[PDB]
Design a protein around this ligand. Structure first.
Ligand SMILES: Nc1nc2c(ncn2[C@@H]2O[C@H](COP(=O)(O)OP(=O)(O)OP(=O)(O)O)[C@@H](O)[C@H]2O)c(=O)[nH]1
Lengths: 222, 441, 39
């Protein structure tokens, strides 16, 4: 079964490990669809997004079964809502998620608890990447539109309105990007490296799954 | 997302040859454009799409269009890369060899044959959908090169206002032709203030010195400096050509590096590298990146005022030395009190399909800085221009077209270029003051 | 003598492990309760 390729695929899918390009493309293609589905209600039709997702999955290589069996779904609760459900914390956006139906005999190792952890981490990374994409789009609109760069009429505005919001966007970028790099290097990168180095000459598959769930817990218990 | 490279002048042709060779060696494409990777495994983590077009033959044609007034250099680049580039992506203006090192002749050549270049770039853009911007490779010193660059910059700003346009420009060394070369520069620099969304600066004197330092033979060939520029361009594009999680767009890099469109001139640095042992740790790599003898431009400053700095470390690195060097650099680099002391590091993955560079396992680093050293070279160039202009009226003898019909408009254009670069350097030196952002505080 | 004080590193690693175990057990009880007893 070549478990290494399967774990690499699932890290690419749910952890974005060396797969930021695909998720970034999917976000850029459907920014408007996501915002129109998060501002509307559950009765709003999201079949266009599902068609785009299945088209992207069809354009995916058939060998990547983890991506070929990837299925999308809409939730009734937000991410902080399910976080309050599973963890004792206090919180209509981010109702999307992705799931995999692990078959036999792969389902005996890839249980449903790890799948739920993957869904949670994936929705979290999706939130983070969508916010970074919004910041990038804001910077693009600021640095490309001529009206924003244009100045005149005894401005008093550029230095006060434009410069201020530019500095504020810089602050937001220095916060979001900093925390993203921190979490992806001191948490994501280290856990990925441990997951890579553990399967070297394994002893017990149950031990492998226990190490995987312990890494997921360390990610959660951060 | 796709980016197109623009090679202007013989300098542009040389650096494009070197960069495309480097990228074909990295992405395993070779000089024939065919995939040097086996067809049994299709899993890849790089992105050849924005720089290479893959056909049914699975051949990667470089997404670059060469524009020059000298067909010999382009023909030679084609000869050394037979079967690599597309003959339709070649533009020589069909005017024969180059003639005249003034910006007037180059800009007139650009204006006359603008339709062909527009058709070429439109065909290249229509080949795909997700396009992001262009890459311009030219020397401000070259007259025809600077004229073509300014013409294409005007065309792309009044034609594609949504596509961010960045350029690479190398300022000449302390030599004799500057008395006219600087002319072209400031003219190009004029457009660089108006339409250029981003610009990476280079100084030929510092480049030659650093090459003579790293190379054993002090007789530095221009092709060696072209190799250095190809290495720095491949390094800054490593996050784009090899994105994993964080950086997947040049827009993000210019976000974290360019705070405002008025300040879009960045100084590069890259160390250590060859062009075979490891003796520079990531901490050492970064402290050398700070060192002036590792920057690709003449610093000529005791303590430059850094505004926004961002670096990419290539190699397998532990975050401990990262944090130590970050703390030391914050203790070393000064930031204005009105701006942020932002320092960002990108871990650039190594290509497994690239032949191993000399000094293996030697971690390296590139850094892009926005400081008052770029304006120092700008002031040198503008002072040379002012001297050679207010002291001698000889530029009224080498002009073409609208510039040759009357030299008073040429004098007015040069004075306006001087005025706009003066306003630019004044904005820069004011940004060094905390009172720059006083309008809000 | 006097009763020896409980070690600092000991109580630190113990509180860390206990927090981790509480979280893990809450998450496991939240995930369908694989533990069962039948007749
Ligand atoms: N580093 C480097 N710089 C070059 C190279 N070739 C040209 N240049 C730059 O180009 C300047 C000289 O101008 P030219 O390259 O001849 O450009 P031009 O004056 O328009 O003449 P043509 O290119 O023939 O049209 C020098 O100051 C260099 O900075 C090169 O191979 N390496």
């Amino acid at each position: 079964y070549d478990l290494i390729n399967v774990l690499k695929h699932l890290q690419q899918i749910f952890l974005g490990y060396q797969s930021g390009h695909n998720v970034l493309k999917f976000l850029t293609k459907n920014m408007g669809e996501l915002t129109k589905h998060y501002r509307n209600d559950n009765n709003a039709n999201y079949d266009k997004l599902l068609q785009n997702f299945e088209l992207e999955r069809q354009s995916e290589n058939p060998n990547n079964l983890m991506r070929q069996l990837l299925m999308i779904q809409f939730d009734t609760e937000t991410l902080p809502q399910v976080l309050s459900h599973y963890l004792q914390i206090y919180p209509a956006i981010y109702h999307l998620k992705f799931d995999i139906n692990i078959p036999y005999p792969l389902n005996i190792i890839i249980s449903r608890t790890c799948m739920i952890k993957y869904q949670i981490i994936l929705r979290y990374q999706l939130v983070l990447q969508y916010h970074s994409r919004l910041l990038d789009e804001t910077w693009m609109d600021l640095n490309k539109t001529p009206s924003w760069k244009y100045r005149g009429y005894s401005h008093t505005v550029k230095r006060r309105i434009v410069r201020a919001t530019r500095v504020l966007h810089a602050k937001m970028n220095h916060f979001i990007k900093t925390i993203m790099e921190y979490f992806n290097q001191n948490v994501i990168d280290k856990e990925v490296y441990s997951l890579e180095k553990c399967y070297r000459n394994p002893t017990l598959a149950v031990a492998i799954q226990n190490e995987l769930e312990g890494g997921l817990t360390n990610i959660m218990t951060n | 997302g796709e980016i197109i490279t623009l090679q202007a002048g013989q300098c542009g042709n040389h650096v494009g040859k070197f960069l495309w060779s480097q990228l074909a060696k990295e992405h395993a494409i070779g000089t024939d454009g065919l995939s040097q990777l086996p067809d049994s495994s299709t899993e890849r983590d790089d992105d050849t799409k924005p720089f290479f077009r893959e056909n049914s033959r699975n051949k990667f044609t470089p997404r670059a269009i060469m524009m020059d007034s000298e067909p010999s250099v382009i023909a030679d680049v084609e000869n050394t890369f037979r079967g690599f580039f597309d003959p339709r992506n070649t533009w020589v203006a069909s005017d024969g060899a180059s003639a005249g090192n003034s910006w007037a002749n180059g800009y007139d050549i650009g204006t006359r044959n603008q339709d062909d270049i527009l058709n070429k770039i439109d065909k290249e853009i229509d080949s795909t959908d997700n396009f992001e911007g262009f890459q311009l490779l030219h020397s401000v010193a070259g007259g025809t090169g600077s004229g073509l660059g300014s013409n294409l910059l005007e065309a792309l700003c009044d034609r594609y206002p949504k596509k961010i346009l960045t350029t690479y420009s190398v300022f000449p060394a302390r030599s004799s032709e500057v008395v006219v070369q600087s002319y072209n520069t400031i003219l190009a620099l004029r457009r660089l203030i108006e339409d250029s969304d981003a610009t990476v600066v280079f100084d030929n004197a510092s480049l030659l010195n650093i090459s003579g330092k790293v190379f054993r033979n002090p007789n530095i060939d221009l092709q060696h400096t072209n190799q250095l520029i190809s290495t720095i361009i491949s390094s800054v594009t490593n996050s784009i050509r090899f994105p994993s999680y964080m950086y997947s767009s040049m827009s993000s890099i210019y976000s974290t590096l360019i705070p405002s469109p008025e300040l879009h001139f960045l100084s590069p640095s890259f160390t250590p590298f060859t062009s075979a042992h490891k003796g520079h740790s990531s901490y050492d790599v970064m402290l050398d990146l700070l060192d002036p003898s590792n920057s690709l431009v003449s610093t000529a400053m005791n303590n430059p005022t850094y505004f926004n700095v961002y670096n990419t470390i290539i190699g397998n690195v532990e975050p401990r030395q990262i944090s130590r060097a970050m703390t030391k650099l914050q203790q070393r680099i000064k930031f204005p009190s009105w701006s942020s002391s932002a320092m960002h590091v990108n871990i650039g993955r190594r290509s497994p399909y690239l032949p191993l560079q000399p000094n293996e396992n030697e971690v390296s680093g590139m850094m892009l800085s926005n400081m008052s050293t770029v304006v120092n070279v700008f002031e040198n160039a503008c002072n040379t221009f002012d001297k050679v202009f207010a002291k001698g009226a000889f530029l009224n003898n080498y002009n073409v077209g609208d510039l040759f019909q009357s030299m008073q408009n040429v004098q007015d254009e040069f004075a306006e270029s001087r005025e706009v670069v003066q306003s630019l350097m004044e904005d820069y030196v004011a940004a060094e003051q905390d009172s720059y952002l006083d309008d809000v505080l | 003598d006097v009763p020896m004080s409980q070690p600092l590193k000991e109580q630190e690693v113990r509180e860390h492990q206990m927090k981790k175990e509480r979280f893990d057990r809450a998450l496991e009880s939240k995930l369908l309760g694989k533990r069962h007893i039948t007749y």
